Amino acid sequence: SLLSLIRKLIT
């Protein structure tokens, strides 16, 4: 869930 969106703002 949260790791599916915020992942693009970190890698």
3-state SS class at 5: coil
CA distance 11 to 5: 11
**Half-sphere exposure in the Cβ direction for 1 (13 Å, CA):** 0
Range 1-11 burial, b when 16+ CB lie within 10 A, else e:
eeeeeeeeeee
What are the structure tokens assigned to 1, written together? 């869930």
The phi and psi torsions of 3 (rounded to 5 degrees) equal -65, 0
Q: How was this structure determined?
A: NMR
CA distance 11 to 8: 5
3-state SS class at 1: coil
Farthest CA pair distance, the chain: 16
